[PDB]
Motif scaffolding. Structure first.
Motif: not given
Lengths: 327, 54, 48, 109, 109
Positions: A102-103, B19-22, D3-7, D100-102
Motif C-alpha cells: 500500500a506504499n 503513492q509508490r516510488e519510481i 507526477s502523473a506523467v512520470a507514473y 529489486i522490489r517494484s
C-alpha cells in the motif's frame, strides 16, 4: 493518459484532480473526581499531596492509556492477519507485505504486541532454536524476549488485548488534548501533568455535605486516518490463532447444594478467553451456568458444563466439556 | 442554550495520498537511438552483424 | 482540403504500419495470459 | 501533472516488460523458491546471454514469498548468522543477482 | 513522444528475458461468510490465495441462488430476495489445470 502517435483523431481527454478531506473531533472528558468529608480531611488525610493528588494523577494517566488502547483496537480493520503459534514469522512478514504493497512509508512504524503474542514469539521454534535463527548466544531462550522481527522492533504492552499485535505507521492514529480552563466563578486551582498532558485540577467545598470536592480532568479526542476510498491501510492487526480450549481446574464438585463457582477457559496459548465464550449446561434442573462462566447448583446430582469459543479464524466453535457434581 | 457561530477550519498536517516510488525507468535501456524523425517511417533500422559457418 | 477539415491519415503512419515494426504486447490484466501476438515473434529481415 | 506523467511513463515501461513475448512462465514454488530462480538463470545461460548487466525485478508478493521461505529464514539453511530474512524482511542477493522490489509490475511476478 | 521495443533473436524467439510467477494452491475470500444488510445493499468480494496476492480481478464468480443474490463478473454482489445464496469464486492458477474454488454463503434478509 496515452494516445497513439500520428493518430488521425487529435482528441485529448482531460484528467480531473480532486482533493479529499477528513474530520478530527474532540469528544471526550476524561476525569477523576473525589470527595472528602471535613472529618476525613482533618484526620484521615495525613499528607494531602501524596495520598490524594498522586493517586488521582496516576488513575487519570491509566485512563488516558486505556483511551489510546481503545482507539488502537477499535479501528476499522478490513482483515485480521492470523498468527499461527507454531510458526509466527510468516504472519508478521505478511503484515509487512500488506503495509508495503500500500506504499506506506517504511519509517516511523510502531509494532505493539500483547503479552500473549510476545510469549508466543518467545515460544516459537523459529526464535527459540539457535540454528533456525542465528544468534547462537540465545536470547529467546535464556531471556524470554525476541528483540526484532520482520524488520520492526517489538514493544510489549498490557494495555491492549493479550493475544493481539498492531503494526501502525505514525500517521495512522491522531490524538488531541485540550486542557479545560478554570472558570472565574470556581476557586483557582493548580494544573498537573500526566504523560506530558496538562490537566486541570479544580476544588470546591460542598457545604451541604460538609466536605471538600476535587475534580481533575482534560478533554481528549481521537481519530483514525482512513484513506480517500474509505479503506484503512495505515495499520494492520494480528491475532493469535487458537486451536483448542480447556477449562482450568478439571472436573470439580460444588461446595454445597446451592454452591457457586467461577470458570476460567484457556486456549492452547493459555490466554483467558472466558469473556469470549458461551456456556451451556447439559441439565439445568440441577446445575445452571450463566453467560459469564458462573456455575451454580440448584439440585444435587451430576451435570455437564460445556464452553463454546468461536476462534479468531472463525468456523466451528471449539468446545470444552467438564463435569460438575453438586453434593 | 448558547449557539455560537464558528468558522470552518482546514489544515494540512502532512498526511498525503500514498503513492509508490519510481524504480523501473532507471533500469531499462533508455535512448540508444536518437534520430527517429530523420529516418523514414519513424523507423531506425538496426543491423545485426553477420555470422558464418565452416 | 480545408483547414477546419478533420486531420487526414498520415502517410508516414501508413508506411510505418505497413513495415510492421510497431510493438504490440500482451495485456497485463487479461486472465489467462494472452497468446503472443504474431508481430512480436516475427523474424528479422534478411536484408539490411 | 508532472507526477502523473512520470507514473504514466513507468506504467509504459512496465507494460513493455510484462507484455514482452515470453514462451513460458517459470513457476515459483512458495515452499521452495530458489529452484525457480536457478532455472531462470539456466534458461538465460542456455541461450548464451552475457552474465553481466542482468536485472531482476520482483513484485511485492514474490519478495514476501522469498522472505517467508524456510531456505532464507532458517540461518542453518542459508548461512548468514545475522539473519537478514528474519530480523529484516529483505532477502537481497539471490542466485547471483540483486533483487529489486517494484510495485509497478504485477504483485506475484 | 515515446517508443519501446524488445530485442528478439534472428528467428523471432525471445531469449533475453525470463518471466517467473508464483504458484497458487488454494483461494479464500476475505471476510468469510456474512449476511448482507439489505436487499439493495452491495458488497465487493475480495479474493486471496495462500501467497497473499489479490486475485479478485483474476477470478470468475457464480451464484447458486440467483433469485436471492446476484454477483457481477468483477466480484461485486447485490442481494435480490430473502434467503441464502452460495456464491463461488473460481480461479485458474498460473500452473494451469483444475480451477481452485472458494465458496461463501450470503444471507439476504
Amino acid at each position: 493518459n496515452r494516445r497513439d502517435l500520428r493518430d488521425p483523431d487529435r482528441t485529448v481527454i482531460a484528467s480531473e484532480l480532486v482533493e479529499h478531506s477528513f474530520g478530527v473531533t474532540l469528544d471526550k472528558h476524561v476525569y477523576a473526581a473525589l470527595k472528602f468529608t471535613d472529618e476525613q480531611r482533618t484526620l484521615d488525610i495525613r499528607d494531602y499531596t501524596k495520598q490524594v493528588l498522586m493517586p488521582q494523577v496516576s488513575a487519570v494517566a491509566y485512563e488516558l492509556e486505556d483511551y489510546i488502547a481503545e482507539l488502537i483496537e477499535g479501528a476499522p480493520y478490513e482483515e485480521t492477519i492470523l498468527i499461527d503459534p507454531a510458526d509466527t514469522v510468516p504472519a508478521f512478514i505478511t503484515a509487512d507485505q500488506r503495509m508495503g504493497e500500500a506504499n506506506v512509508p517504511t519509517d516511523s512504524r510502531r509494532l505493539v504486541v500483547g503479552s500473549a503474542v510476545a510469549a508466543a514469539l518467545a515460544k516459537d521454534k523459529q526464535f527459540r532454536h539457535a540454528d533456525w535463527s542465528g544468534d547462537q548466544a540465545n536470547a529467546a531462550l535464556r531471556e524470554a524476549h525476541v528483540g526484532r522481527l520482520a524488520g520492526m522492533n517489538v514493544i510489549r504492552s498490557n494495555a491492549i488485548a493479550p493475544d493481539k499485535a498492531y503494526l501502525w505507521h505514525r500517521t495512522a492514529f491522531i490524538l488531541a488534548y485540550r486542557t479545560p480552563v478554570v472558570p472565574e466563578g470556581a476557586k483557582a486551582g493548580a494544573s498537573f501533568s500526566a504523560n506530558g498532558v496538562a490537566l486541570r485540577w479544580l476544588a470546591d467545598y460542598d457545604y451541604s455535605q460538609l466536605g471538600d470536592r476535587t475534580l481533575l480532568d482534560v478533554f481528549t479526542g481521537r481519530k483514525v486516518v482512513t484513506e480517500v476510498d474509505g479503506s484503512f491501510v495505515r495499520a494492520v492487526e494480528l491475532q493469535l490463532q487458537a486451536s483448542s480450549i480447556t477449562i482450568v481446574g478439571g472436573a470439580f464438585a460444588l461446595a454445597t447444594t446451592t454452591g457457586t463457582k467461577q470458570l476460567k477457559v484457556r486456549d492452547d496459548n493459555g490466554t483467558d478467553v472466558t469473556a469470549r465464550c458461551t456456556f451451556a449446561s447439559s441439565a439445568g434442573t440441577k446445575a445452571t451456568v450463566s453467560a459469564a462462566g458462573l456455575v451454580t447448583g440448584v439440585a444435587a446430582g451430576t451435570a455437564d458444563i460445556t464452553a463454546s469459543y468461536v476462534p479468531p479464524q472463525g468456523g466451528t466453535a471449539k468446545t470444552a466439556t467438564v463435569t460438575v457434581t453438586v453434593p | 442554550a448558547h449557539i455560537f457561530v464558528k468558522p470552518e477550519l482546514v489544515a494540512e498536517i502532512g498526511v498525503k495520498q500514498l503513492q509508490r516510488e519510481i524504480v523501473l525507468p532507471g533500469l531499462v535501456w533508455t535512448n540508444p537511438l536518437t534520430d527517429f524523425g530523420g529516418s523514414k517511417n519513424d523507423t531506425i533500422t538496426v543491423r545485426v552483424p553477420a555470422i558464418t559457418t565452416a | 482540403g480545408l483547414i477546419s477539415d478533420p486531420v487526414e491519415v498520415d502517410p508516414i503512419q501508413v508506411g510505418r504500419d505497413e513495415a510492421g515494426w510497431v510493438q504490440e504486447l500482451r495485456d497485463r490484466e487479461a486472465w489467462p495470459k494472452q497468446e503472443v501476438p504474431e508481430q512480436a515473434k516475427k523474424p528479422a529481415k534478411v536484408g539490411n
